[PDB]
Design a protein around this ligand. Structure first.
Ligand SMILES: OC[C@H]1O[C@H](O[C@H]2[C@@H](O)[C@H](O)[C@@H](CO)O[C@@H]2O)[C@@H](O)[C@@H](O)[C@@H]1O
Ligand SMILES: [Ca+2]
Length: 135
């Protein structure tokens, strides 16, 4: 069962929470990771299409589309490439077309574009974004 406002009460329920913020309250990737971890969770990992649908439905309910959200995607060592901050393997992927492209060699964190495609993009970790936590 999820905490109230994070999901449903069944044993199979996945718990995610959107943090959509105005520009003065958006956070860098590291700030967002630390925020979710302080609650006992982490930035959201998306391990399968079911979790993707769960998050998309939260976005539809929020009424705001096209927003960019930090996910738990962070580059590891050169041999690893992208990892999830929660330690789970990056197996399921939904990178946008041509991504990750490490544009200008400075893109080491992953964001979700909150439109129906639910696609991922690598971007500069110091950008200020909305974020999604999991617990
Ligand atoms: O800004 C770097 C970014 O540029 C291009 O992505 C565009 C768009 O698809 C992104 O959603 C937004 C927000 O991140 O930025 C651009 O408008 C692509 O070259 C992309 O790989 C790159 O990260
Ligand atoms: Ca990119």
């Amino acid at each position: 069962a999820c905490p109230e406002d994070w999901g449903a009460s069944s044993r199979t329920s996945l718990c995610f929470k959107l943090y959509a913020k105005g520009k003065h309250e958006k956070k860098t990737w590291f700030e967002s990771r630390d925020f979710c971890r302080a609650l006992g969770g982490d930035l959201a990992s998306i391990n399968n299409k079911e979790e993707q649908q769960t998050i998309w439905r939260l976005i539809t309910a929020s009424g705001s589309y096209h927003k960019l959200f930090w996910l738990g995607l962070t580059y590891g060592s050169p041999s690893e490439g992208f990892t999830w901050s929660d330690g789970s393997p990056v197996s399921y992927e939904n990178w946008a077309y041509g991504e990750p492209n490490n544009y200008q060699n400075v893109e080491y964190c992953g964001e979700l574009k909150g439109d129906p495609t639910m696609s991922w993009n690598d971007i500069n970790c110091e950008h200020l974004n909305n974020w999604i936590c999991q617990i």
